[PDB]
């Protein structure tokens with residue numbers, strides 16, 4: 001048996017645009033993911049977030065599922081454009097009402113809300129003004145955060161500024177694969193820097209407004225391994241993983257190898273912001289899915305395909321990664337608290353004739369990673385919680401509905417939810433506070 005500490009937080013996680021649908025209901029402004037997915041060629045099968053899981057109407061059902069599974073925490077995000085349809089200025093009471101009902105319901109049912117303030121659905125109005133490229137987004141983000149803290153900070157006490165700011169910056173603004181779909185490296189690194197400045201301004205506002213809660217930030221992380229016998233691994237870790245952001249937050253500069261590669265792309269006087277960026281945070285959130293074999297390649301980095309089980313994303317399954325990254329964050333920055341804020345897998349789920357989804361592959365994946373997380377706890381990592389991505393099959397960004405990450409299956413023709421074997425399994429882990 002592998003039992004977790006008392007009070008350890010078992011959660012599931014979603015994001016607004018991936019599940020809600022009704023992106024323009026009740027006065028909401030367009031987000032950059034509305035406009036990006038309605039642009040031909042950007043998302044697989046022409047999929048959009050217009051309907052998704054219809055969580056906008058079905059929220060009560062979905063939460064009742066969380067309750068019924070005895071899951072203790074729900075990580076969800078708020079749609080900035082539902083709250084402030086032009087990004088700044090006017091506040092939309094019906095947007096506040098929607099999340100208010102969700103929050104109050106969670107608290108009634110004894111589930112701890114973890115709110116992601118930004119999970120990628122930037123108001124379109126602000127993209128017109130440059131979005132993450134514009135230094136002014138630090139103010140816009142502060143104002144938005146303020147509104148949330150003022151309206152919800154009486155009940156929500158666990159907050160996350162940004163989800164995966166590397167993805168926001170690099171995949172949105174260099175690769176052009178995510179909204180706003182840009183391919184400019186100088187824009188991409190100004191977005192990195194402004195994400196940090198916006199994150200830090202929101203923390204500062206938080207200290208002024210919600211004097212009894214906790215705030216952190218979530219990073220994507222891969223477990224990079226070298227193809228032979230190492231510096232490419234070093235760069236990938238410093239660039240793709242938490243150090244890009246944590247080195248500024250804890251040490252006041254970007255990591256060495258990031259500067260080696262990217263100095264020319266950062267603002268000239270970027271160091272002038274670093275003291276503000278060092279605003280103290282309460283926890284680090286790490287997302288982790290996959291491992292990668294890496295080699296130098298005259299980026300100067302390429303991936304090497306390996307044997308190894310893969311998911312439907314083609315991501316290699318390497319459970320020891322989650323242990324490595326947990327050990328590595330403690331070793332490198334020693335944050336007071338850590339959460340695994342996302343871990344999960346996409347498989348080609350089928351509803352069997354018995355009416356059930358026999359996702360033994362997802363159970364195996366989750367089990368292995370939870371065991372590795374447990375190990376890190378035994379070896380001193382202050383892991384306070386673990387969140388499964390995702391509660392529901394949902395809109396998987398540029399992959400559309402073709403990648404199912406849920407522990408609950410969604411039949412999109414009817415919106416029926418069918419708890420998967422992995423969900424039932426996870427429920428028992430939560431009840432038991434660990435593996436048996």
Ligand SMILES: OC[C@H]1NC[C@H](O)[C@@H](O)[C@@H]1O
Nearest residue numbers: 015163164287342389396
């Ligand atoms: O790709 C899987 C998962 N990765 C991390 C992102 O937070 C989430 O939105 C996405 O669905």
